[PDB]
Design a protein around this ligand. Structure first.
Ligand SMILES: Nc1ncnc2c1ncn2[C@@H]1O[C@H](COP(=O)(O)OP(=O)(O)O)[C@@H](O)[C@H]1O
Ligand SMILES: [Mg+2]
Ligand SMILES: [Mg+2]
Lengths: 333, 325
């Protein structure tokens, strides 16, 4: 019996956590959820508490915390505060075409490894004179090496052939330059893995026309945000793909695209697939593989029946109908 | 009769510039060309080609071989602050996206192309993203003016003010301020990751997009990929003193540089864009319609668009079709 931190988050986060728990009880999952909430206040009490809870349990499942960008710079993203403080350096998502979800592209199977702690997300800005703002993108050798190390290790453990570094080192020559250097330094230790690089501009252009060429992709923080979203979209959108945040000692599971879903909150139409799949990845990490594969099979099977599809993938079904259908593939195991 | 300074550029450039001029002549366009050459002298463009553009206020540019980048200089020389990219699905050239009708409006002076980086210590690098009141205001007013003048209804500011609160929030604040003045254009704001997310799913939900330098650099190529690539995509840089340079953004293509095979579409469509900027709507339309019909017919498609015909043939058919008005 494991104790896991659960941050419900905002928008559709709370309602989906409820379905997660329902599914967990019905599958007899030996996991207790220890809920911690993160409000809207500029006061960082809630967020530091959440961080401390994850330090004990070392594993969390969270919804997306709203960041109000009309607030002052000192009020920072709680999502970002969290993963930077816990040093969850690796953000990994797996975008794979779902045979039941027909889109404009097929045979997409891409692993995206995104640097999760520095780059454009360092929250370093200032106003030297009135109306002249500088923001400071930070690229380091230590963090670039570990992200690259993680990307190559994953590729060879998964039986995958190619790692593509995406960057803009033709413009940010020193910054993105160093990131490349660190990827190359790691590449030397993996002669079996084909290493390529590609400019983020070209990468997106390639993704919308021939995304099948990509196998494993490693990149700095912002470009990760971009590529993750393009890739989720190609396979059918934000309700489908799960997302992991790994540190050396901690792991936090969430939906790939990190969407609050405020505009569809409480209307029983949120797609549950992404969150369920995140919760399975968490089970696999907690070494509860039997329960993972059991829940994973049900949600992937519910995906085949196009009658159980929510609006974000063309269907008209509700969240609760999908949960029923998932719970039903479980109670027949 | 109006004068445009023509920069034929490199590799396949001279060819496709020759193709455009020829088609323009076939259309009886009120345009004569003032051929110049830009090569960095020891760093600035030749003295006698700057004055040429200062004179004409209006220029057309082929693909340029790079290393000091020639585009950086031209940008700085003429203060070309707005990069404009209309992406529209080509009926003769099917991609998985058939309903794309988008204009990306890119701030082209500052943002993350500040030029400034430092090695803080060994293995720790800082790249400065720079955002100012004036440049952000300038680009916002351009985007709304463009919206109005080109029969456009929605403008979306694309940002990450959630993550980059001071810089992007400032950019966003100037867009919001301009929006209040131009109430006849509908304004909304969207996170960059959400724009990408929706763009690859349903491009039709967007109209005009305004954004800082790196985002628009990236997003403009994304949009190009929706409609068939860089070889078919028009682009214009609008600057200070009413100056504008329209350009092809594809490669130099040295492999086929003088062996025909080159595709003039993108430049021609930039030249059509130029024409519309000049008020020559009738000529723009005819050349555009001609180009389109040629592509749709699909007889004289160049090797990149899947055909077998050479540049000469493709140009000839456009010329032939334009003459029928
Ligand atoms: N699980 C989901 N099911 C259906 N639509 C979703 C889901 N998650 C996100 N979306 C949609 O994806 C879009 C972007 O999400 P959004 O709520 O704007 O994220 P954020 O507030 O973090 O920027 C929205 O249209 C949202 O309704
Ligand atoms: Mg979010
Ligand atoms: Mg570009």
């Amino acid at each position: 019996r494991h104790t896991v931190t659960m941050i419900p988050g905002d928008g559709i986060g709370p309602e989906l956590m409820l379905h997660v728990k329902s599914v967990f009880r019905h599958a007899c999952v030996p996991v207790d959820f220890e809920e911690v909430h993160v409000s809207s206040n500029a006061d960082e009490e809630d967020i530091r508490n959440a961080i401390m809870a994850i330090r004990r349990n070392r594993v969390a499942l969270k919804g997306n915390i709203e960041t109000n960008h009309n607030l002052p710079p000192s009020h920072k993203s709680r999502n970002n505060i969290l993963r930077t403080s816990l040093d969850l350096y690796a953000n990994v998502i797996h975008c794979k075409s779902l045979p039941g979800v027909v889109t404009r592209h097929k045979d997409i199977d891409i692993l995206i490894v995104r640097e999760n702690t520095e780059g454009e997300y360092s929250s370093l800005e200032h106003e030297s004179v009135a109306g002249v703002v500088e923001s400071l993108k930070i690229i380091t050798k230590a963090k670039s090496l570990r992200i690259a190390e993680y990307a190559f290790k994953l590729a060879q453990e998964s039986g995958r052939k190619k790692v593509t570094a995406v960057h803009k080192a033709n413009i940010m020559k020193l910054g993105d330059g160093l990131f490349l250097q660190c990827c190359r330094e790691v590449a030397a230790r993996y002669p079996q893995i084909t290493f390529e690089n590609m400019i983020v501009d070209n990468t997106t252009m390639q993704l919308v026309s021939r995304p099948q060429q990509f196998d494993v992709m490693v990149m700095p923080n912002l470009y990760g945000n971009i590529v993750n979203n393009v890739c989720a979209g190609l396979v059918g959108g934000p309700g489908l793909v799960a997302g992991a945040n790994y540190g050396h000692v901690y792991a936090v599971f969430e939906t790939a695209t990190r969407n609050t879903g405020k505009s569809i909150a409480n209307k029983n139409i949120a797609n549950p697939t992404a969150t369920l799949l995140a919760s399975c990845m968490m089970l696999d990490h907690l070494k509860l593989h039997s329960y993972a594969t059991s829940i994973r099979k049900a949600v992937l099977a519910s995906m085949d029946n196009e009658n159980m599809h929510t609006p974000d993938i063309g269907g008209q079904g509700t969240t609760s109908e999908a949960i029923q259908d998932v719970i039903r593939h479980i109670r027949v195991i | 009769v109006q004068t445009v300074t023509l920069i034929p550029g490199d590799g396949i450039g001279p060819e496709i510039s020759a193709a455009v001029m020829k088609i323009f002549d076939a259309a009886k366009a009120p345009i004569q060309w003032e051929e110049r050459n830009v090569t960095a002298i020891q760093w600035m463009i030749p003295s006698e080609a700057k004055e040429s553009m200062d004179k004409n206020k209006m220029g057309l540019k082929g693909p340029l071989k790079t290393p000091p980048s020639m585009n950086l200089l031209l940008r700085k020389t003429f203060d070309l602050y707005a990069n404009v990219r209309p992406c529209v699905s080509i009926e003769g050239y099917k991609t998985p996206y058939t309903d794309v009708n988008i204009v990306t409006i890119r701030e082209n002076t500052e943002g993350e192309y500040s030029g400034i980086e430092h090695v803080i210590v060994d293995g720790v690098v800082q790249s400065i993203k720079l955002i100012t009141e004036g440049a952000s205001k300038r680009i916002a007013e351009f985007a709304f003016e463009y919206a109005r003048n080109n029969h456009r209804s929605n403008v979306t500011a694309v940002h990450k003010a959630n993550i980059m609160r001071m810089s992007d929030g400032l950019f966003l604040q100037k867009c919001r301020e301009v929006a209040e003045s131009c109430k006849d254009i509908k304004f909304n704001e969207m996170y960059l990751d959400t724009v990408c997310l929706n763009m690859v799913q349903d491009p039709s939900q967007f109209d005009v997009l305004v954004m800082p330098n790196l985002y628009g650099d990236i997003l403009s190529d994304l949009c190009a990929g929706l409609i068939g690539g860089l070889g078919v995509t028009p682009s214009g840089n609008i600057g200070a003193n009413g100056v504008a340079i329209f350009e092809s953004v594809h490669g130099t293509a040295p492999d086929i540089a003088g062996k025909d095979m080159a595709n003039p579409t993108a430049l021609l469509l930039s030249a059509v864009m130029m024409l519309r900027h000049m008020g020559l709507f009738d000529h723009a339309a005819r050349i555009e319609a001609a180009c389109f019909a040629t592509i749709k017919d699909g007889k004289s498609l160049t090797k990149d668009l899947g055909g077998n015909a050479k540049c000469s043939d493709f140009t000839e058919e456009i010329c032939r079709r334009v003459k029928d008005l």
